[PDB]
Amino acid sequence: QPEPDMITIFIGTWNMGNAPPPKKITSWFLSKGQGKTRDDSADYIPHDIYVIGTQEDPLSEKEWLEILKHSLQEITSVTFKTVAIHTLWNIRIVVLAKPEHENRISHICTDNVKTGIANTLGNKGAVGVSFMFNGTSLGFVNSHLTSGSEKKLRRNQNYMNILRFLALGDKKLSPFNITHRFTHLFWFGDLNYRVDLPTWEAETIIQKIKQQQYADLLSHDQLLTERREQKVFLHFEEEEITFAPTYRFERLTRDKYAYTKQKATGMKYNLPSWCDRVLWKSYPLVHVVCQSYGSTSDIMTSDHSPVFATFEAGVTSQFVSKNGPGTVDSQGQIEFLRCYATLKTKSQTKFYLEFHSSCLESFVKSQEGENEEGSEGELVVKFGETLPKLKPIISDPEYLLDQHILISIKSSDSDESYGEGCIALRLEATETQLPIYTPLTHHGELTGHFQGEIKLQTSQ
Numbered sequence: 001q002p003e004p005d006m007i008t009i010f011i012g013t014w015n016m017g018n019a020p021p022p023k024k025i026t027s028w029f030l031s032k033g034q035g036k037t038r039d040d041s042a043d044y045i046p047h048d049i050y051v052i053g054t055q056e057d058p059l060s061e062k063e064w065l066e067i068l069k070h071s072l073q074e075i076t077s078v079t080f081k082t083v084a085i086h087t088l089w090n091i092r093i094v095v096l097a098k099p100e101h102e103n104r105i106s107h108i109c110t111d112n113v114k115t116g117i118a119n120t121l122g123n124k125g126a127v128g129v130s131f132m133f134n135g136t137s138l139g140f141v142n143s144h145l146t147s148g149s150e151k152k153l154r155r156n157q158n159y160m161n162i163l164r165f166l167a168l169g170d171k172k173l174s175p176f177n178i179t180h181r182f183t184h185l186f187w188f189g190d191l192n193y194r195v196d197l198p199t200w201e202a203e204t205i206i207q208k209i210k211q212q213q214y215a216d217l218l219s220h221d222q223l224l225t226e227r228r229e230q231k232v233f234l235h236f237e238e239e240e241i242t243f244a245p246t247y248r249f250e251r252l253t254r255d256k257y258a259y260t261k262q263k264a265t266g267m268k269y270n271l272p273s274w275c276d277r278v279l280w281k282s283y284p285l286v287h288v289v290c291q292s293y294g295s296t297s298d299i300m301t302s303d304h305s306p307v308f309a310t311f312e313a314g315v316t317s318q319f320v321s322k323n324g325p326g327t328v329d330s331q332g333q334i335e336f337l338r339c340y341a342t343l344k345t346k347s348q349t350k351f352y353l354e355f356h357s358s359c360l361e362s363f364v365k366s367q368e369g370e371n372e373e374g375s376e377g378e379l380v381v382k383f384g385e386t387l388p389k390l391k392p393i394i395s396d397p398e399y400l401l402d403q404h405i406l407i408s409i410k411s412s413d414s415d416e417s418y419g420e421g422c423i424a425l426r427l428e429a430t431e432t433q434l435p436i437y438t439p440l441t442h443h444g445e446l447t448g449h450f451q452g453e454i455k456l457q458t459s460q
């Protein structure tokens, strides 16, 4: 039985509104309703991995696992294995996989982050799951961010707190947060970003939804506008939204949006909004294609409709040669030429690089680079041809071209990362000097750039 080079992943996000689900939720796992939906001809075909994120979940882990497994079994006649379940308050993530994947999945991690202080600490935050599927690292974050149209700044802060403090993936990758730790990272939930239009426009918005005319609404979506000004989810992707706002509905129908202010809302309007979202970030030049993104029409127990997204995701096998793992393959080398970092920092310390990759026995520290002053104010850190020669554990080009090098630039004085990025080894040529580039981030904010040339030697 050959190891797969592709898997499909189902991502679900549902704010259940503290109500039990209805008896049938199969439409969710089948990607049926509104938006980019799944072909009918695929209905009996199981996804490899189902990741289910809930918010305001009133069920026990036991109660929800029984409904999920029975749902997938009715759809597929396959009995799914539980990989992981983690709950913080009423925020839950469940990971289910086909039984044939049980021995492909290892290094399962779960964590949570509680956002806010005193007043604002008590029910918002994120749960997460990571694991290895053969040679590919996968991370999943379900977040319930701060509610309310006037708290987009708070939501952006909630995001930064989750990506700094969620402890998933390989702890040896110490300079790197979850936005660099995974081949594929999926981040979903009730992100709670609203359509920022005047309250007096509520009926006009409802009219536009009934005409399936979403363009004017999406142009005011706070998550789209915050992302365009690089305030949040920098370097993440989202599929185009072609489904009605998923919040806020009257329960037991989908025919009415309940937007007017009420004691129960803290006298806040809830204009129809895309609260419920799926974004992803994969390493450069890895296959990832969104094959569905939409909302169900027939699950009406909550004031939110469930959202689904499915993805094709590139995966690699666990490689073993005569040499690595457990030694170097003298045939392989990675060389960096004419390299420099450009940093936004106002500081003056010396900087060195760290190279981290699963293709190395352990991370590699460079010599300090030479600081110069950029023509527009910037710090430029020159490495020239000084960077060490990296010694991969395996030289086979079928392995090595599928790998990535994570880069941290660190202060010599403090050993703190000023910037993190990622370089793909999926080059156009081997034994050839080729341009490389990555932006650099710290705490998910843009802090600089790394550029230069690479020269990759494989056994071919």
Ligand SMILES: CN[C@H]1CCCN(c2ccccc2)C1=O
Pocket: 224, 225, 227, 228, 229, 234, 235, 236, 237, 238
């Ligand atoms: C890493 N993805 C980038 C691609 C370029 C455009 N883009 C975007 C799209 C809509 C709203 C705001 C930003 C991104 O996020």
